[PDB]
């Protein structure tokens, strides 16, 4: 004999950039707990999702510039039956401002370099972000950049500007972003004007999608008579050695004969002629075995070899 009561005190609070905490409490009017109740979270906007939880709170990572809406059920299930209560809902209203007041085309890029300034950590991670102002963007308005990785948040201090002195690009030589990180990069571009309201913009980036991979290093090609000998070095990244995909391009400068090998090893040797001149380039990308598929590096500086 059970009629399911919905949870109460359902809250949604912003806990950081693109990050909310859903909170609710079990209905105290629900018949004395002799059976284990669970809950079903449904996210209505801006991106639809639904899942279950054993507890009474849940963190949701989501953009906020479009507002946010969620609902939570009480669920009771065995095998004979499943019971679901009515929905307890809560929403965060969309930010005040006109649509054309927001920035346009937010593009961010992370890069890994070597950290000699700090013996505390291995490798730096830089952040370069660009955007457009907007058609309905006022002439007096200003923008502010913020990012978040994990539990750390920083505001930009290196702004590039346009004609009207309103911010259009950002630069972080140093970040809290982990070079082998596997969490989202929440980026926030806020606004302000004494003569209007500005709609902010936020975006979630995956590191594997924005991390510009550095080229293979020390690319050398030697001609030992009838064969070519090529070697390079696993680029400036925090990723080890058994985790890199390489493409090596051998171009016959004479007739244009072409050979490209996608490999993981750090050296390569093939046949050619004693007759022709060749130029060799190498290209790097983190293997699909350590992370999800990402960007390739630029080809190495063309090393023309032979004659």
């Amino acid at each position: 004999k059970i009629s399911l009561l919905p949870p109460v005190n359902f809250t949604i609070k912003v806990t950081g950039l693109a990050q909310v905490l859903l909170q609710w409490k079990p209905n105290p009017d629900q018949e004395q707990r002799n059976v284990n109740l669970e809950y079903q979270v449904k996210i209505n906007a801006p991106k639809e999702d639904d899942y279950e939880t054993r507890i009474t709170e849940s963190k949701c990572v989501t953009i906020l510039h479009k507002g946010f809406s969620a609902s939570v059920r009480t669920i009771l299930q065995n095998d004979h039956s499943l019971l679901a209560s009515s929905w307890a809902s809560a929403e965060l209203h969309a930010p005040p401002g006109s649509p054309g007041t927001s920035i346009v085309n937010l593009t961010c890029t992370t890069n890994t370099t070597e950290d000699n300034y700090s013996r505390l950590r291995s490798y730096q991670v830089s952040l370069h972000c660009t955007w457009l102002v907007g058609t309905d963007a006022p002439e007096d308005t200003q923008y502010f950049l913020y990012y978040r990785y994990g539990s750390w948040t920083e505001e930009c201090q290196e702004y590039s500007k346009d004609t009207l002195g309103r911010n259009i690009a950002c630069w972080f030589p140093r970040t809290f972003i982990l070079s082998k990180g596997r969490d989202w990069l929440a980026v926030l571009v806020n606004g302000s004007s004494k003569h209007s309201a500005i709609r902010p913009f936020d975006q979630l980036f995956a590191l594997h999608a924005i991390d510009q991979i550095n080229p293979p290093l020390n690319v050398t090609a030697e001609i030992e008579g009838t064969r070519l000998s090529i070697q390079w070095e696993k680029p400036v990244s925090a990723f080890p050695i058994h985790c890199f995909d390489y493409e090596v391009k051998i171009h016959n400068t004479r007739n244009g004969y072409l050979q490209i090998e996608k490999l993981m090893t750090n050296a390569f040797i093939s046949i050619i002629d004693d007759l022709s001149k060749y130029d060799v380039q190498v290209r790097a990308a983190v293997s699909s075995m350590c992370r999800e598929a990402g960007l390739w590096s630029e080809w190495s500086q063309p090393i023309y070899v032979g004659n």
Partner: protein, 109 residues
């Protein structure tokens, strides 16, 4: 029958049968809310089991779930290798410094 190249072929398998596996839209499987993956082997491979006990044992699908089962017993192997060799105090404390050091540097907190 090795191990270090199982994952390479196993991950590649998951990249294909994804559309087949995610066809079940009612199924809810435990997913950790944190990114410290190795702390959650028991839940990950229990999820793999539930996902196996609800999947059409097809052709190139049935192999994936043995490769996952094989990976488990490599992990099950490493698990018992954590505490069956008693060594001298303090090699234990040496290990502990590394442990707390990793949690400090690597882990997200």
């Amino acid at each position: 029958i090795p191990t270090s190249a199982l994952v390479k072929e196993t991950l590649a398998l998951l990249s294909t049968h994804r559309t087949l596996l995610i066809a079940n839209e009612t199924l809810r499987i435990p997913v950790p809310v944190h990114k410290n993956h190795q702390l959650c082997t028991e839940e990950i491979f229990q999820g793999i089991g539930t996902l196996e006990s609800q999947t059409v044992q097809g052709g190139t699908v049935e192999r994936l779930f043995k490769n996952l089962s094989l990976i488990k017993k490599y992990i099950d192997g490493q698990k018992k290798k954590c505490g069956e060799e008693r060594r001298r105090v303090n090699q234990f404390l040496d290990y502990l410094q590394e442990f707390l050091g990793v949690m400090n540097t690597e882990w997200i907190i």
